[PDB]
Symmetry: none
Subunit: 301 residues, 6 copies
Amino acid sequence: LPTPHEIRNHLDDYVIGQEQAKKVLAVAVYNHYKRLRNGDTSNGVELGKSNILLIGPTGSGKTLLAETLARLLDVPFTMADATTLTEAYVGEDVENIIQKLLQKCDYDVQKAQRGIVYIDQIDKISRKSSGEGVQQALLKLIEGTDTSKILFICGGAFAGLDKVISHRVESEGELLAQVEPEDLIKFGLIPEFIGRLPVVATLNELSEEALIQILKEPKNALTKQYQALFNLEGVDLEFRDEALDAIAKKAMARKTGARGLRSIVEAALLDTMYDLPSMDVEKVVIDESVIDGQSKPLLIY
Amino acid sequence: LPTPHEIRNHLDDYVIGQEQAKKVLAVAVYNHYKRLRNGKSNILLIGPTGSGKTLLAETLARLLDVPFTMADATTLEDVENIIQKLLQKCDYDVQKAQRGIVYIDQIDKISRGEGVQQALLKLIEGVDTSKILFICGGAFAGLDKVISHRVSEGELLAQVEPEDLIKFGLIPEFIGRLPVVATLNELSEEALIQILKEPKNALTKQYQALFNLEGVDLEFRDEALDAIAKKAMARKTGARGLRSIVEAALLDTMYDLPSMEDVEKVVIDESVIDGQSKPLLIY
Amino acid sequence: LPTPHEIRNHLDDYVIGQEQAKKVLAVAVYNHYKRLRNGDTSNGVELGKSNILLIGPTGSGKTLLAETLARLLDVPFTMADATTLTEGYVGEDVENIIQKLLQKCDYDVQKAQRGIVYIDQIDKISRSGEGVQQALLKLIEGTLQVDTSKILFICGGAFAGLDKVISHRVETGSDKASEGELLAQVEPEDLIKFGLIPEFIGRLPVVATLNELSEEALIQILKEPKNALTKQYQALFNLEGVDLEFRDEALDAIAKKAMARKTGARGLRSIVEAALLDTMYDLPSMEDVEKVVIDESVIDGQSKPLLIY
Amino acid sequence: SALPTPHEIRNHLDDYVIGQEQAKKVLAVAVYNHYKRLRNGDTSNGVELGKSNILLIGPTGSGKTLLAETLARLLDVPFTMADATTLTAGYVGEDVENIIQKLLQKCDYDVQKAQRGIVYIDQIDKISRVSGEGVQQALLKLIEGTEFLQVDTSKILFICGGAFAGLDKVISHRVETGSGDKASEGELLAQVEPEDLIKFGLIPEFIGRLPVVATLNELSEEALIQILKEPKNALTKQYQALFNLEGVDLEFRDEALDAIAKKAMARKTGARGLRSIVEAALLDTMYDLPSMEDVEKVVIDESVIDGQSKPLLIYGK
Amino acid sequence: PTPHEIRNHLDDYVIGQEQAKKVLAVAVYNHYKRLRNGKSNILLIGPTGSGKTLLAETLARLLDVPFTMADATTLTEAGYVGEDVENIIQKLLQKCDYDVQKAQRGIVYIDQIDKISGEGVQQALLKLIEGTDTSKILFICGGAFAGLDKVISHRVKSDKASEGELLAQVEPEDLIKFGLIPEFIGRLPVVATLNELSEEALIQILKEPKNALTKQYQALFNLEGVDLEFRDEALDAIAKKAMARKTGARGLRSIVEAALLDTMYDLPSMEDVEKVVIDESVIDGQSKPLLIY
Amino acid sequence: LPTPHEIRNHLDDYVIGQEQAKKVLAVAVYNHYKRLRNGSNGVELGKSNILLIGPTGSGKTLLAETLARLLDVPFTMADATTLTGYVGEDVENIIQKLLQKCDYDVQKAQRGIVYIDQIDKISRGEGVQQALLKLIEGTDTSKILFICGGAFAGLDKVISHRVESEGELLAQVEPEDLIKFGLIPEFIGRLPVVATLNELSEEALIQILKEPKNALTKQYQALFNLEGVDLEFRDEALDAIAKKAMARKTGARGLRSIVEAALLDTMYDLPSMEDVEKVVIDESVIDGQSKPLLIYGKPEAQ
């Protein structure tokens, strides 16, 4: 098994920032499978399963984190939506997420027990005051009937949670750290459900400096990918710092997070990529070319 | 023998606050044994987890030198096992056994357990399980809301009525056997402390087993457990906020533990409440 | 066997009011056991078993009535809650009722067949709850090896909603006399619209309605029954060598307050105990001759009981 | 032994049920053919015999339920009732098996007897068309066939009774659309075709399994009267036997019986509301009867419909 | 044969449906005309017993071309549907004498395609319409489409629109909303509609199918040791009455059961050799079936 | 390889309008195969599957088939509706149907293009998105290009609810807009390239009837040609067909049904008469009133 140190390190390669949330997941995950290999019992005491609750803005990395730690653990992974299952056959449907897990699991019961399950938009199922019924149906899953062995991760934006925390205690990232199970209670989640989610991870909103960092530093960074594309044409693609900043700015205005990044970049390079193979030594993308879209990239011969 | 005045006085030494609940327990208990000495009233404890429910029960049993036994509704013929468990601590003396006290925890959990209510009810009535006093504790997390709807949370509990319990999930015949109802508003620091270490699945025990897989011995100093309870009462989350407090104090330690060779680890309070110092590491 | 007349007379001693319902029960009961003694068959035709359905507000005497008529017939009695039957199929729960009957019956099959079974809160299972009606329905008919046929079944229920559906039907293509007068017009189909299945209602031919207890009734309940609250507390204060007296105005005040809460005779004890709590607490530490509870002490709770030395 | 001819089966139905001659003729044939098929086997000869489950259509309290119970009795065959509204969640298919185990219980756990058994589903019109429709399809798997007995629900006979309040109108509209004679429910229920059930809410594949359709005529005043005295377990006979244990002779003037019927028609409960009407009229009498010395008691219509007068008491001994 | 000639020959086998016969004539002619010179597939939409199957079988005879029938329901709900596909081809090859040439000229009729909209079958069945060579053969898909008439109405003139006319306004989009996949409909460019039932089809339904009503009742009467016979005129009278009610093949059983009800009732109480059902017994219901001792 | 310039030029010949969508496809396609040929340098290039968003009969399917032809690459179609239990066998079936037209060659198969129609239909079905998602990545289905077309009738409204003509609005489309529509995040992330199609103009419909290689007019003219007859469509007639096609809003789809109806009678009794040529006017099409004009070849008669 990989030490929490190792797991976090490999998470740093797929996700930028969120160091705290990653440290948490690393430990929660490590202890989880460490329990399975040794058995829930022993020694004279029954260890407790520790399902995870991911709390962060949309486009923060919640889903990616889940998919990633499943990959670096060569463990079968499956996604599900709390809203898609919110209304339906009812709870009978919830068992189907197991057959979807079994499918990617090759029908092997042992690997399936190792599997990880990510439930998205769990904050949506809580009543604003049918959705609550789902929490209880999905609650039966969390315990087991065996769904016990498998790890459950539940992500959500929790837009309102931010306010109730400020209210109870009377700085966005700071407030999230102060979150308590009772705060989720006032949000709409039932006590018996939250008790099944002991491990609570908070994800900070991406900074303008973060987006910039995401554009160039990751191994699969957008800039690196396009530079490699322009590289096949024998052309050298260069992004000015001011340009990267301009992209981030525009990405925050749309509040899509790191998601709207690629769409912004591809649009700024669309024209260039089109008539490139029919003509250069290198091409330079300035902020005037990105945010304004008025000027075409600089062409060097 | 002990007057209600005297009984409450002795209760004040074991639990703090809850003057009303204690006044009620004193009278209920006094009347119960007073009717036995001269030859059908029980108690229902409603309060948050860690409010002293269990302690109060255990206490009034001690100050009455009467055999005491606990039982959990979650584990409810195990019914007859509660009497033989009472008989064991009773030395198998039928007389002392009938004077015995029985505390049932988490009865609010069995209110949809409904088949348990009837089975547990036959006991309350009537070894003749008629003379023994029954005290049933429960959190009743939902009861606070139904009382409000019947038309803050502390004053509301005072207005609780058997009908409210009916809407909660308790059957009429069961509630009729629990005429006396006492409510609690505050948690007991000592209770929380007790919860952290004494239960079979106590937090401390769980983490000790976790650290055990690493071949490391985890030790909680008493001062530490008390610092955890204190903080838990400041947030008024009850026994719920306990785990979140403990995990946070052990988070760092759990992270870089599998990468070092330690004999044992000691969590002092300065590590918990202050969070300023890391646990002590012994090689 | 005691004539229906005699049965009703002995019910008058344990229950206050409800003269109509008691007349019904008396007849139903009398006919039931009269059938068992002569056999369901004969002569050339099969008599029909007549289980009862009690419909009345909470704390009106439904349970007491059942318990009582069991006593004055020296017949084994057992209680059960329809709610407990819902918590799956509970075929074992359903049959559990019989072994609990057998226990109080001394394991005697004959006495068990004579037994009476009261199911409380049946209105609660009206349309997992339905499944219970059907499972409980198998009981009513019959199958320890004991046959549940011979045994009488009484099913009580508040039926809060029933009052409205009867009005919706009996209305005229308002106002209705009263809740009690409306209950009298109750019909098997009205129970149908409430949530009870036809096959179940057909097994409950005898329908008895209970009117809300009067303030004068509540007062009567506080002092006249053998186990009256006032008598119980007077005996309690008696152990301390003190004489407890309730002024008539006080008993009235208790009733008044009990009707405001609409708990019926149920909320009586909680009211009385609250008024005497303080007094019971510091009583064993003082020397009094007697104590007097006035209406100012009960309804207002502002003044403490009068202490005589 | 030998099976009872349709003739014989109808004759014995006459003893327990008043009127409904046509319906009874139908059920008789449907039932006779059913068990004749089981004895001979579904296979052969050179052709596959078709199972013929029955669909009872009649107003509430018209004898649908009784008719089912009866033909079961006179065929010494295990019988079980079920309610369609109970099945209509997802554990309906499980409760389906519960109908079989409830049959098995009364069957003495014998697989052969169970296969002969009869199953009556009440209020099928209630589940008409999404959650209700699903049940039709879940109950439809039953009709065909598949602590477990592993028996095939095929062999057993299925009867499905329902009021079909709206069905009366849709049939009229089908006939009204073309050729827009007296409306008469009777000359309409007889005209009903499977497609009419379709427009009502029943799925095609379901109706196809209910090939035999027996309709029940609304009870006349005369029928009710006839029901109160002529059947073997008639109300009057039952009460007369009750009053007989007291050594008293109970008599119902014909005038009383009609007054009961009238009142029963006003409530439109059918034969159901009959017992309730009668017991209310004899309640007082039954109460103070055991405490007095009478020769006989006479119930007049003034005692029933008006309830103002108590029964006439004759003294003798 | 010219489309003129083809229609003329179709008139001799089926009555009415002049329009659908005109379309079929053109679709068929164009299909084989393109083959001779080296996807004009047909979709039949009509109530059950309108002649859909008869039409397909007929134009196959008048073109001396191998014909084969298939049921979409047999294929559905299985993974061996793709294999049963080749089974349709080998079934076509058998009646074709295993001559590849004649096989490619063959016609294939798929019945109850509206039933599968089953959607995994549309795809499986689609790969056939295209080609592997199942390209040259003509495909005709029949269906009742009971729900289709309603979606066309909703798709949206005074005095409303007759059902026989509403179907003439059918469009591929309407089929889409019905349940058929776009790629499947695109392979069935030719759509023919029928407004009238076929007396001859219904008659055919009463006696020829393996589970035919007449066969069923004959077996029932067989258990009594009685021989039940249906005179041709009787079967005809049943069909007629069935068309007046426009219930289709559905209203057949109800008609037959009524004509045999009395007889079935008092049959087990008498000793007969056989029983004959005439049209006077069916349509008029005035005379009881006829009893040979 | 063909430059995006060249690819777009050849698309112009088969598809009318959609200049923007075709510019996008050209780039996406070009970069895709350019990646396969080269596999570097020190960074991993990202596969760029395409998501076609446009009304029915706008050219989505045609575009896909076309760029497959002008790249001599195996092509296969599939419908997201047929994919809706798990249908793991259906999902992989798309591969064997691709292998069939691919001649069982693994290399050509990796080059293949796959078009999934009606993806908007399976929007939150979700299970299919995830099963189809495993495809997009690879298990190798990685090398092959995926194009997913959909009408997204509701998408137009949600975009307006956020951004607050139809074609101008589609240009403002964002991955989050698809999210609110019903598509799962992990699926949209696999569809980086988004192309929007404009509604076709009447001039376009007219252009589609006569100019494409498989144009309807050409197909029927070849049909009438086997009878030795010359079929001619008057400009006014082609215009009348387009008009009627726009009234039904079926797009280029309802074109054939319109044309076939106008030539039905004629095709029926044609093989039974001796004509030189046939002229279809706008009166015969939009009105359905007058039969086509029949011109008789010189006898022949004697």
